[PDB]
Design an enzyme around this catalytic site. Structure first.
Site, PDB file in Angstrom:
ATOM      1  N   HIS A 117       0.789  -1.226   0.007  1.00  0.00           N
ATOM      2  CA  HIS A 117      -0.120  -0.128   0.148  1.00  0.00           C
ATOM      3  C   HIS A 117       0.868   1.294   0.068  1.00  0.00           C
ATOM      4  O   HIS A 117       0.721   2.248   0.949  1.00  0.00           O
ATOM      5  CB  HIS A 117      -0.906  -0.217   1.190  1.00  0.00           C
ATOM      6  CG  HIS A 117      -2.129  -0.946   0.889  1.00  0.00           C
ATOM      7  ND1 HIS A 117      -2.378  -2.371   1.362  1.00  0.00           N
ATOM      8  CD2 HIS A 117      -3.108  -1.061   0.104  1.00  0.00           C
ATOM      9  CE1 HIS A 117      -3.349  -2.751   0.944  1.00  0.00           C
ATOM     10  NE2 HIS A 117      -3.847  -2.128   0.159  1.00  0.00           N
ATOM     11  N   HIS A 153       2.105   1.731  -5.699  1.00  0.00           N
ATOM     12  CA  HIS A 153       0.518   1.134  -5.974  1.00  0.00           C
ATOM     13  C   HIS A 153      -0.370   2.111  -6.348  1.00  0.00           C
ATOM     14  O   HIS A 153      -1.431   1.985  -7.239  1.00  0.00           O
ATOM     15  CB  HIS A 153      -0.098   0.444  -4.398  1.00  0.00           C
ATOM     16  CG  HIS A 153      -1.619   0.294  -4.593  1.00  0.00           C
ATOM     17  ND1 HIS A 153      -2.209  -0.668  -5.189  1.00  0.00           N
ATOM     18  CD2 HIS A 153      -2.578   0.831  -3.786  1.00  0.00           C
ATOM     19  CE1 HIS A 153      -3.577  -0.709  -5.076  1.00  0.00           C
ATOM     20  NE2 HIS A 153      -3.551   0.275  -3.946  1.00  0.00           N
ATOM     21  N   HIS A 192      -5.868   7.546  -3.552  1.00  0.00           N
ATOM     22  CA  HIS A 192      -6.965   6.436  -2.821  1.00  0.00           C
ATOM     23  C   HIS A 192      -6.627   5.600  -1.408  1.00  0.00           C
ATOM     24  O   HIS A 192      -7.437   5.288  -0.834  1.00  0.00           O
ATOM     25  CB  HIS A 192      -7.616   5.582  -3.874  1.00  0.00           C
ATOM     26  CG  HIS A 192      -6.925   4.261  -4.323  1.00  0.00           C
ATOM     27  ND1 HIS A 192      -5.570   4.475  -4.943  1.00  0.00           N
ATOM     28  CD2 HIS A 192      -6.928   3.110  -3.695  1.00  0.00           C
ATOM     29  CE1 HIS A 192      -4.942   3.231  -4.776  1.00  0.00           C
ATOM     30  NE2 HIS A 192      -5.925   2.420  -3.940  1.00  0.00           N
ATOM     31  N   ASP A 207      -8.119  -0.667  -8.681  1.00  0.00           N
ATOM     32  CA  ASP A 207      -7.403  -0.959  -7.317  1.00  0.00           C
ATOM     33  C   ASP A 207      -6.940  -2.476  -7.274  1.00  0.00           C
ATOM     34  O   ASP A 207      -5.950  -2.945  -6.595  1.00  0.00           O
ATOM     35  CB  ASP A 207      -8.457  -0.836  -6.245  1.00  0.00           C
ATOM     36  CG  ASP A 207      -7.661  -0.800  -5.023  1.00  0.00           C
ATOM     37  OD1 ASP A 207      -6.504  -0.647  -4.988  1.00  0.00           O
ATOM     38  OD2 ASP A 207      -8.592  -0.693  -3.731  1.00  0.00           O
TER      39      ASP A 207
HETATM   40  O1  IO4 Z   1      -5.213 -11.339  -2.943  1.00  0.00           O
HETATM   41  C1  IO4 Z   1      -6.199 -11.378  -2.040  1.00  0.00           C
HETATM   42  N1  IO4 Z   1      -7.002  -9.875  -1.743  1.00  0.00           N
HETATM   43  C2  IO4 Z   1      -6.527  -8.650  -2.435  1.00  0.00           C
HETATM   44  C3  IO4 Z   1      -7.292  -7.754  -1.751  1.00  0.00           C
HETATM   45  C4  IO4 Z   1      -6.777  -6.361  -2.154  1.00  0.00           C
HETATM   46  N2  IO4 Z   1      -6.165  -6.051  -3.427  1.00  0.00           N
HETATM   47  C5  IO4 Z   1      -5.539  -7.381  -3.916  1.00  0.00           C
HETATM   48 CL1  IO4 Z   1      -4.445  -7.264  -5.303  1.00  0.00          CL
HETATM   49  C6  IO4 Z   1      -5.755  -8.722  -3.396  1.00  0.00           C
HETATM   50  C7  IO4 Z   1      -6.710 -12.669  -1.467  1.00  0.00           C
HETATM   51  C8  IO4 Z   1      -8.179 -12.604  -1.043  1.00  0.00           C
HETATM   52  C9  IO4 Z   1      -8.612 -13.610  -0.462  1.00  0.00           C
HETATM   53  C10 IO4 Z   1      -7.538 -14.712  -0.317  1.00  0.00           C
HETATM   54  C11 IO4 Z   1      -7.567 -15.908   0.744  1.00  0.00           C
HETATM   55  C12 IO4 Z   1      -6.148 -16.196   0.816  1.00  0.00           C
HETATM   56  C13 IO4 Z   1      -5.804 -17.290   1.337  1.00  0.00           C
HETATM   57  C14 IO4 Z   1      -6.654 -18.439   1.886  1.00  0.00           C
HETATM   58  C15 IO4 Z   1      -6.370 -19.642   2.395  1.00  0.00           C
HETATM   59  C16 IO4 Z   1      -4.900 -19.747   3.011  1.00  0.00           C
HETATM   60  C17 IO4 Z   1      -4.109 -18.856   2.373  1.00  0.00           C
HETATM   61  C18 IO4 Z   1      -4.430 -17.524   1.781  1.00  0.00           C
HETATM   62  N3  IO4 Z   1      -5.444 -15.604   0.125  1.00  0.00           N
HETATM   63  N4  IO4 Z   1      -6.159 -14.524  -0.261  1.00  0.00           N
HETATM   64  C19 IO4 Z   1      -5.779 -13.293  -0.942  1.00  0.00           C
HETATM   65 MG    MG Z   2      -7.367   1.026   0.297  1.00  0.00          MG
HETATM   66 ZN    ZN Z   3      -5.605   0.526  -3.168  1.00  0.00          ZN
END
Ligand code: IO4
Ligand code: MG
Ligand code: ZN
Length: 313
Positions: free
Chosen positions: A68, A72, A106, A217
């Protein structure tokens, strides 16, 4: 007035593409942003001296966190640039001005912690802003910087135009709270499919700009695989640090934030692509057909994560 920004040939060409990576040379990112404002808005939109001073104060108010950060901010602005340039006639003069600034600002003063962690920590900001805690802070920081001496890039706008652009920026920044994305997309899906979507309805435009903000985003999932894969490292570096801080408060973090569950990252990415990213770019492509490359790239990266699970990399 007659002073254009010009990028090297490779950057001049690839900055127009959705999957453009702004590169590791931090000193070129201000120039890349000004270039994008000049082409998407005009050389007349902002006083160059005021814009440069605004940009450098925004940079200073981003922290040295793994994801962040300033990179970004400029990355999210570039995705908005690509959407605006591919949708020339759809957006007002005020929208083109506001949305690039909204994207740059943002995540202002982000600490690398979720709204959820601020609430459980009992951070002062969680008492000031009960919902969309960090996003109300990001907007507050944007207004703060706009009110610094010599930083008012909107000074040439009338009183009502100024209020309109700051309202575009507020809604655009609040929309980056992913908690609000799910309901926004469902409403947009119903409006499009029942054919009631009307871009002259201000409340409809607001929803569409909201989805654009989510798309910009999340745009790390729309890069070429090597960029997407390396960006994932920075995302989880923050998540795992938050998980550590959850454990310090005596709270077992969600698996996403637990570094002890690195092994489940590939399956977590699949869930994210299927539940958030693909639906986001799908609905965006239905409303704005020229944004299809974002959906194509997202699908390409989903396929890559599927390959990771199958041990093919
Ligand atoms: O990348 C993600 N969110 C995100 C948010 C904002 N901006 C960006 Cl670019 C990306 C994301 C979302 C859900 C989730 C579940 C698990 C997960 C589940 C089980 C074990 C290890 C990990 N990892 N994980 C990553
Ligand atoms: Mg944000
Ligand atoms: Zn952002």
């Amino acid at each position: 007035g007659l002073m254009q920004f010009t990028l090297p040939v490779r950057l001049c060409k690839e900055i127009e593409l959705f999957h453009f990576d702004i590169g590791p040379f931090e000193n070129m990112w201000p120039g890349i942003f000004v270039y994008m404002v000049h082409r998407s808005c005009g050389t007349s939109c902002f006083e160059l001296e005021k814009l440069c001073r605004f940009i450098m104060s925004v940079k200073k108010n981003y922290r040295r966190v793994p994801y962040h950060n300033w990179k970004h901010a400029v990355t999210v602005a570039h995705c908005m640039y690509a959407i605006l340039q591919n949708n020339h006639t759809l957006f007002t003069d005020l929208e083109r001005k506001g949305l690039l600034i909204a994207c740059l600002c943002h995540d202002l003063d982000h600490r690398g912690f979720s709204n959820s962690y601020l609430q459980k920590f009992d951070h002062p900001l969680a008492a000031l802003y009960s919902t969309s805690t960090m996003e109300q802070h990001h907007f507050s920081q944007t207004v703060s910087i706009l009110q610094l001496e010599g930083h008012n890039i909107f000074s040439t706008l009338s009183s009502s135009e100024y209020e309109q652009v700051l309202e575009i920026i507020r809604k655009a920044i609040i929309a980056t709270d992913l908690a609000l994305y799910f309901g926004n997309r469902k409403q947009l899906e119903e409006m499009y499919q029942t054919g009631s979507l009307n871009l002259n309805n201000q409340s409809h435009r607001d929803r569409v700009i909201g989805l654009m903000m989510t798309a910009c985003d999340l745009c790390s999932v729309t890069k070429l695989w090597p960029v997407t894969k390396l960006t994932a490292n920075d995302i989880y570096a923050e998540f795992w640090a938050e998980g550590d801080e959850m454990k310090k408060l005596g709270i077992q973090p969600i698996p996403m934030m637990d570094r002890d569950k690195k092994d489940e990252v590939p399956q977590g990415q699949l869930g994210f692509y299927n539940a958030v990213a693909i639906p986001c770019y799908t609905t965006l492509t239905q409303i704005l057909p020229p944004t299809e490359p974002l959906l194509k790239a997202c699908r390409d990266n989903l396929s890559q994560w599927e390959k990771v699970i199958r041990g093919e990399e």
